[PDB]
C-alpha cells in the first residue's frame, strides 16, 4: 500500500483528456466525416463509440484504479498466463515514442519559424522552389503547392533522399526541436504526478483556447459555411456501405487509445472508491466533442479556400500531417493578422501532441516502476536515460530522409500490434478474469455493478469489433509505399518484426510460465488462471 495519488481529481481528468485528444482529432476525424457522408458518418462513428470504443475505454481505466498497479504488474497480478500482455503493451508504447514525438518537433519548428512579418510558405520565388510550383493545391500529381514544397524542400529536406537507405545529413535545427520536445517532457515527468498532473493544465487546456480562437476566426470568413456544408451534409448511402464502418470503428479505437497501458497507468493513481464510471463517460465525450469542434475549425478555413482562392476542395480536404502542416498553414497566410494564427496554431499542435505523448511515456515508467522496485527508488535518473535513448535514435527522425523512417513506424510499429494486444486484454477479462469476477470489483469502489449493457459489450460486441478492424486491416495491407517510393522487400520485413516483437511476447510468456510452474497440465492451467489477491 501507500502509493501516491492525484493531487486533485482534475489533475487526473486533464491528464487523460489531454492524452486522448491528439492530432487525429484534428487531421483524421473531420476528413472522415467529409470522406464518408458528412453527418451520416456520425452514426457508425457514434455506434462504434457506444458499443466498441467507450466500453473498452471504460475498461482499461477501471482496471487501473482497481488493481492500483502498473500495466505489467497489473496484468501479471490478475491472469499470470497472459502476463506477456503487459510487456507487449509497454513495448508498443516504447516504440511509439521514437516517432510520435517528431510531430511535436515539426510543429515546434514551424512555431519559431513563424516569428517574422511575412510567413515563408507562401511564395515560390525562393532558393528551394521548383518550376513546377503552384500558389495553392491542385488535383495534379507532380505540380505541388507553395507549402508542399516548403515542407519537403526546406523543412524536411526530404528531396535529397533516394529512399530509406539514403538518409543524408542531420537537420540540426530539427534535432534541437526534438531535443526541446523531450526536454520539456523530462521537466514535466520526473518529479512524478505532483508536476505531470499540473503541466497537463497547460497542454490539455491551451488547445481549447486556441481551438475557440480559430473557431471564431474560421466561421467569420468568406465561404466559411461552404466548408461546414462539405463537413456535415448527409449522404446516408454511406451507411449502407462497409468501409465506412471500418473507417468509423478504426478512428474510435485510436482516437481513444484504450488498452495502450496509459489509462491503466493514469488510473492506477486514483483513489480506490472513485466514480470511474463518471470519469470514463465524461472524458471520452470531451474527446469526441473536441473532434467535432475541431472539424468546424478545419472546414471553416477549408471552405474559405474554395471560395476566395479557387481550389477544388477534394485537393485540400485531406488527412494526416498534410492537413496541419501544409493545407491549413497555407490558408492562414492569406488572411490578415497571419503571424498571430500561425503561432497559436502550431503551439496548439504542440500541446495536442505533448499531453498525448506524456501518457505513453508515463505508462512505460509506471508499468515497471511497480514491477522493478529499483526503478521507483531513483526515477529522475531513469527517464533521463530512456529519453536520451529516445533522443539518439530520434536523430534518425531528424535526418534528410527522416520522414521515410517516421512513416514506417506509423504503419508498423503500433499499427496491428496494439490491435491484437487489446484483443487479448478483452478476452483475458471477459472469459479468463470473468465478468462476474470483474463486476463486483467495480461494485466495490463505485458502489454499483456495471449494467448488463457493459457486460454484453465487453463479452460479445467488443471482441468482434476488434476483429472487425483487424480482418479489414490485413486485407487492406499492401507493401509500404510513399508517393513514388516503394519500400524495399526487407523494409516491410523489419516492420513486421517491430510489430511482431510485441505480440510474440504474449505466448513467449504463456509458454515460459507454463513450463516454469510445477504440476500437471490441468493443475498448471488452473494454477495460472488464479489472480494475485487470492
Amino acid at each position, epitope marked *: 500500500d501507500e502509493r501516491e495519488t492525484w493531487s486533485g481529481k482534475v489533475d487526473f481528468l486533464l491528464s487523460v483528456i489531454g492524452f486522448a485528444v491528439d492530432l487525429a482529432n484534428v487531421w483524421r476525424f473531420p476528413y472522415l466525416c467529409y470522406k464518408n457522408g458528412g453527418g451520416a458518418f456520425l452514426v457508425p462513428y457514434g455506434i462504434m463509440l457506444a458499443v466498441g470504443g467507450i466500453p473498452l475505454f471504460y475498461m482499461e481505466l477501471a482496471l487501473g484504479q482497481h488493481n492500483r498497479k502498473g500495466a505489467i504488474t497489473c496484468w501479471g497480478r490478475l491472469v499470470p498466463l497472459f502476463k506477456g500482455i503487459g510487456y507487449a503493451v509497454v513495448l508498443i508504447a516504447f516504440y511509439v515514442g521514437f516517432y510520435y514525438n517528431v510531430i511535436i518537433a515539426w510543429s515546434l519548428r514551424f512555431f519559431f519559424a513563424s516569428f517574422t512579418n511575412s510567413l515563408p510558405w507562401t511564395s515560390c520565388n525562393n532558393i528551394w522552389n521548383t518550376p513546377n510550383c503552384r500558389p495553392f493545391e491542385g488535383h495534379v500529381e507532380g505540380f505541388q503547392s507553395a507549402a508542399s514544397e516548403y515542407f519537403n524542400r526546406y523543412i524536411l529536406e526530404l528531396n535529397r533522399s533516394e529512399g530509406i537507405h539514403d538518409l543524408g545529413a542531420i537537420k540540426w535545427d530539427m534535432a534541437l526541436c526534438l531535443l526541446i520536445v523531450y526536454l520539456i517532457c523530462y521537466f514535466s515527468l520526473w518529479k512524478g504526478i505532483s508536476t505531470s498532473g499540473k503541466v497537463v493544465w497547460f497542454t490539455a487546456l491551451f488547445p481549447y483556447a486556441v481551438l475557440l480562437i480559430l473557431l471564431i476566426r474560421g466561421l467569420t470568413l468568406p465561404g466559411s459555411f461552404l466548408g461546414i456544408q462539405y463537413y456535415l451534409t448527409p449522404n446516408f448511402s454511406a451507411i449502407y456501405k462497409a468501409e465506412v464502418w471500418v473507417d468509423a470503428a478504426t478512428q474510435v479505437f485510436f482516437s481513444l487509445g484504450p488498452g495502450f497501458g496509459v489509462l491503466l497507468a493514469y488510473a492506477s493513481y486514483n483513489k480506490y472508491h472513485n466514480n470511474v464510471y463518471k470519469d470514463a463517460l465524461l472524458t471520452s465525450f470531451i474527446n469526441s466533442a473536441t473532434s467535432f469542434i475541431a472539424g468546424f475549425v478545419i472546414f471553416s478555413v477549408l471552405g474559405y479556400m474554395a471560395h476566395t482562392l479557387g481550389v477544388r476542395i477534394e485537393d485540400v480536404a485531406t488527412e494526416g500531417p498534410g492537413l496541419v502542416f501544409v493545407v491549413y498553414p497555407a490558408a492562414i497566410a492569406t488572411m490578415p493578422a497571419s503571424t498571430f494564427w500561425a503561432l497559436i496554431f502550431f503551439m496548439m499542435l504542440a500541446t495536442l501532441g505533448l499531453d498525448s505523448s506524456f501518457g505513453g511515456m508515463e505508462a512505460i515508467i509506471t508499468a515497471l516502476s511497480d514491477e522493478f522496485p529499483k526503478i521507483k527508488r531513483n526515477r529522475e535518473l531513469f527517464v533521463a536515460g530512456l529519453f536520451s535513448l529516445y533522443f539518439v535514435v530520434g536523430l534518425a527522425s531528424c535526418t534528410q530522409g527522416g520522414f521515410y523512417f517516421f512513416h514506417l513506424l506509423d504503419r508498423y510499429a503500433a499499427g496491428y500490434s496494439i490491435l491484437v494486444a487489446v484483443f487479448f486484454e478483452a478476452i483475458a477479462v471477459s472469459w479468463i478474469y470473468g465478468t*462476474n*469476477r470483474f*463486476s*463486483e*470489483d467495480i*461494485r*466495490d469502489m463505485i*458502489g*454499483f*455493478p456495471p449494467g448488463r449493457y457493459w457486460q454484453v459489450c465487453w463479452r460479445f460486441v467488443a471482441p468482434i469489433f476488434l476483429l472487425f478492424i483487424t480482418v479489414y486491416g490485413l486485407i487492406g495491407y499492401e507493401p509500404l509505399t510513399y508517393a513514388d517510393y516503394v519500400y524495399p522487400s526487407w523494409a516491410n520485413a523489419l516492420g513486421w518484426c517491430i510489430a511482431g516483437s510485441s505480440v510474440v511476447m504474449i505466448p513467449a510468456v504463456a509458454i515460459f510460465k507454463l513450463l516454469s510452474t510445477p504440476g500437471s497440465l490441468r493443475q498448471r492451467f488452473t494454477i495460472l488462471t488464479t489472480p494475485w*489477491r*487470492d
Partner: antibody
Framework: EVQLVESGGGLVKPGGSLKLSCAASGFTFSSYAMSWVRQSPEKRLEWVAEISSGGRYIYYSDTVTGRFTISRDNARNILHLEMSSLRSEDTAMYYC????????????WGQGTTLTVSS | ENVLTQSPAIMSTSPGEKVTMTCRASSSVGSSYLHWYQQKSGASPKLWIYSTSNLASGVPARFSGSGSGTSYSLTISSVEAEDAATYYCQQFSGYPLTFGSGTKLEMKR
C-alpha cells in the same frame, strides 16, 4: 417473486457458537451482494456483515469482527453466518438483506430468525 | 463510526397532518447513499426511500425525501392511518454501515 428466508437461530450460552443460514429464491442469487443486519430486542437496527456477489470482498462490524464469519455458496443459493465466542449482546433478530447497489440500499429483507445468548 | 441520530423517537400524529422526521449524522454522507426504511409492527423492514429522495415501488407519492450533508429528513404530505410504523434511516457512505435511531409514528386519539 423474490424471497429471503432465514434459519438456524435459538438459545445459546455465552461463549457458545451457532450458524444461521438464509435461503434465496425468486432471483439469481449469484449476482446480488447480501448482508446480515440484526436488530436488538430494543428495536435497534445494527449491521453485522456484507458479503460480495461472489464473496470476494467482505466487511465486518467492529463488534463481531473475528467472532463472526459470513459466507455464501451460490450453487445452493444459501447465505451463511457462523457465530463463535458468542456474547450476550449478540442477541437479536437476524435479517438477511439483499443489497447489491450501495446507492439503492437493501432491496428485499427476509422474515428474520431469532437468537438468544443467555446463561 | 458515523452514527445517525433520528428525531423524534415517538411522533404522535393523526391522519391528515404534515409530519417531518429528521436524521442528523455524525459525519457527512453522500446524497446517493442515504436510505430510509419503514418497519411495521411484527414485520421485517422495507426499503422506503433510496438515495435521499427516490422512493421504492408501492411507496405512495405522499412520501418525500430531502436534506443533504449531515442533516436529512423524511416528510409525509398527508399522513394516512396505515403510515403508523417505525421509520429508520441508513447510510452506505462508508463502513461500518449504520442505521438511524428510528422514529415511531403513533396515531393520535
Amino acid at each position: 417473486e423474490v424471497q429471503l428466508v432465514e434459519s438456524g437461530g435459538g438459545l445459546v450460552k455465552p461463549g457458545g457458537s451457532l450458524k444461521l443460514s438464509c435461503a434465496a429464491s425468486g432471483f439469481t442469487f449469484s449476482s446480488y451482494a447480501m448482508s446480515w443486519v440484526r436488530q436488538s430486542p430494543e428495536k435497534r437496527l445494527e449491521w453485522v456483515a456484507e458479503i460480495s456477489s461472489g464473496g470476494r470482498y467482505i466487511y465486518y462490524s467492529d463488534t463481531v469482527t473475528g467472532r463472526f464469519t459470513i459466507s455464501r455458496d451460490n450453487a445452493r443459493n444459501i447465505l451463511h453466518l457462523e457465530m463463535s465466542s458468542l456474547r450476550s449482546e449478540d442477541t437479536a433478530m437476524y435479517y438477511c438483506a439483499r443489497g447489491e447497489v450501495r446507492q439503492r440500499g437493501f432491496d428485499y429483507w427476509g422474515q428474520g430468525t431469532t437468537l438468544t445468548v443467555s446463561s | 463510526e458515523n452514527v445517525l441520530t433520528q428525531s423524534p423517537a415517538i411522533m404522535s400524529t393523526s391522519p391528515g397532518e404534515k409530519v417531518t422526521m429528521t436524521c442528523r449524522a455524525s459525519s457527512s454522507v453522500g446524497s446517493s447513499y442515504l436510505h430510509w426504511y419503514q418497519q411495521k409492527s411484527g414485520a421485517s423492514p422495507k426499503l422506503w426511500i433510496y438515495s435521499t429522495s427516490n422512493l421504492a415501488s408501492g411507496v405512495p407519492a405522499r412520501f418525500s425525501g430531502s436534506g443533504s450533508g449531515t442533516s436529512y429528513s423524511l416528510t409525509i404530505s398527508s399522513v394516512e392511518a396505515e403510515d403508523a410504523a417505525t421509520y429508520y434511516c441508513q447510510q452506505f457512505s462508508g463502513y461500518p454501515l449504520t442505521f438511524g435511531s428510528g422514529t415511531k409514528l403513533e396515531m393520535k386519539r
